[PDB]
């Protein structure tokens, strides 16, 4: 995989997927 | 919370919250 | 495309896909 | 609103939230 940008412009839609981000990067977390 | 159900007329757009779903409910399995 | 369900059990997280599923529809109305 | 930046690690992750972005964005030409 490669590094990608998610730029948003606004406030609350970016809080939405920084929680589906807080979620899935957890996945890679889980041990 | 309570249960709430989220009905997409589709297939590939209802995968994609599908994700959001398993690592979202793969936080509450974490321990 | 066939009708899927997605049940959420919470209720922010629920909100979350619901504004995923506000523009996702809104596309297949744009018009 | 400001710009924010959404770094995800993979590929297929973000293409995911790359959808809910096209739908959101979308929201905003609608007109």
Chains 1, 2, 3, 4 share one sequence.
């Not at 730029?7 to 970016?14: C, L, M, S, V």
């Amino acid at each position: 995989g490669e590094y990608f940008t998610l730029q948003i412009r606004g406030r609350e839609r970016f809080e939405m997927f920084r929680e589906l981000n807080e979620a899935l990067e957890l996945k890679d977390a889980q041990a």
